[PDB]
Amino acid sequence: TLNGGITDMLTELANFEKNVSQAIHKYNAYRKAASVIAKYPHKIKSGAEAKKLPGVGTKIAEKIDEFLATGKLRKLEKIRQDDTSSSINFLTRVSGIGPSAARKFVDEGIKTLEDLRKNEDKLNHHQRIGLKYFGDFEKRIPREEMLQMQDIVLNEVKKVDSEYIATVCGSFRRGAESSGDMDVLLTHPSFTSESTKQPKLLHQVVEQLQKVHFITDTLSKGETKFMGVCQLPSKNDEKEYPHRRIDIRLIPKDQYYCGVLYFTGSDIFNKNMRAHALEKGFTINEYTIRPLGVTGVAGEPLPVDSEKDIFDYIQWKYREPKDRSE
DNA sequence: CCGACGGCGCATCAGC
DNA sequence: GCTGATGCGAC
DNA sequence: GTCGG
Ligand SMILES: Nc1ccn([C@H]2C[C@H](O)[C@@H](COP(=O)(O)OP(=O)(O)CP(=O)(O)O)O2)c(=O)n1
Ligand SMILES: [Cl-]
Ligand SMILES: [Cl-]
Ligand SMILES: [Mg+2]
Ligand SMILES: [Mg+2]
Ligand code: NA
Numbered sequence A: 001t002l003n004g005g006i007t008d009m010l011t012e013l014a015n016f017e018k019n020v021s022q023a024i025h026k027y028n029a030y031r032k033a034a035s036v037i038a039k040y041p042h043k044i045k046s047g048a049e050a051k052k053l054p055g056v057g058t059k060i061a062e063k064i065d066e067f068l069a070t071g072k073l074r075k076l077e078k079i080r081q082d083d084t085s086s087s088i089n090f091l092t093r094v095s096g097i098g099p100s101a102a103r104k105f106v107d108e109g110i111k112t113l114e115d116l117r118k119n120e121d122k123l124n125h126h127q128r129i130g131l132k133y134f135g136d137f138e139k140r141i142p143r144e145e146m147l148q149m150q151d152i153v154l155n156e157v158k159k160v161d162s163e164y165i166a167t168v169c170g171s172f173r174r175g176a177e178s179s180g181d182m183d184v185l186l187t188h189p190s191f192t193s194e195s196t197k198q199p200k201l202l203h204q205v206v207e208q209l210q211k212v213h214f215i216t217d218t219l220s221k222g223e224t225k226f227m228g229v230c231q232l233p234s235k236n237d238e239k240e241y242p243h244r245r246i247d248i249r250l251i252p253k254d255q256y257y258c259g260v261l262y263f264t265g266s267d268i269f270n271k272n273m274r275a276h277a278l279e280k281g282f283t284i285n286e287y288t289i290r291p292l293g294v295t296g297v298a299g300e301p302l303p304v305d306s307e308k309d310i311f312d313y314i315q316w317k318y319r320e321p322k323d324r325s326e
Numbered sequence B: 001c002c003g004a005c006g007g008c009g010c011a012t013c014a015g016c
Numbered sequence C: 001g002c003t004g005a006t007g008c009g010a011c
Numbered sequence D: 001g002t003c004g005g
């Protein structure tokens, strides 16, 4: 928050370009600029000063000058006034409504929360759950509740099969004092890059968490990724905890370190690291790190025995999770 | 210039 | 039914 | 919107 006013402005610009303009690269540019400015340890006094940071160019520098002089950006003031932009921006805050659906709903006269509730028949399953928990999903999760949630998931996972390992990643693993959701990496030795020796490995864990009423709703579910809703249990006479988003990713056990690197993030950190890998002649996904031939086609997976190995391949100093909140 | 911009799982739909 | 393109996802 | 070559 040293430069909170500027990073707020760029984040709002990013959301506009994403949600309304459907200009994903402009969205990514604004987020990169906000990220590099957020970690800049001086209170910025001019666009010129910010234009020294990689990712801040001529246009954003101009916007920082307008913002530092007036406290505001006319481009954003009129965006907030535009009814279509405001409606599209709002609707995309419902889980399952993306830019395209939001604009299509706006065309059909569906523009408000009350509009959405009247038109549940027009919503797919994901969207209906996002509407149902609209208020809950915008609340953050205190780290203390993340600790209680972790304890349930790991213990319940242990009850299904003592050989599962569940690791909470995302902002939690980066040490955040609050999280937007809970992200769980799951491994089991029967599932490796060589073979799947046991079916329903993710299903059995989802079922156990549903059985004890931790998982309450499913947004999407396949063999390796679960996206849904969970809730802490409350004591007698206690108000209920909000419902929370939970994501679970089942990763081949021999590919744990690439998987935990990916699932720890942040997303911008992953983008930065993967772009640098490319510049160094490697490609990184949640499973492997592979070299790029002269062709550009990926080669064979390189041996990985820690997170640090992946950093070493691309000639980066190791960064602890807490230092990856870009 | 101007081409690139990380990478992929699940849901839903068009076309066969 | 399958394959491939698209939306969505913090995207 | 920004960057590299
Ligand atoms: N566009 C994306 C989105 C996500 N990811 C990866 C990194 C996330 O940490 C990780 C979890 O994805 P996430 O959306 O849960 O992001 P968090 O860092 O946990 C921030 P939160 O506390 O949830 O509000 O998945 C990514 O690589 N690329
Ligand atoms: Cl774009
Ligand atoms: Cl791979
Ligand atoms: Mg998260
Ligand atoms: Mg998540
Ligand atoms: Na710059």
Ligand code: NA
Residues within 6 Å of the ligand: A091, A092, A093, A094, A095, A096, A097, A098
């Ligand atoms: Na949404």
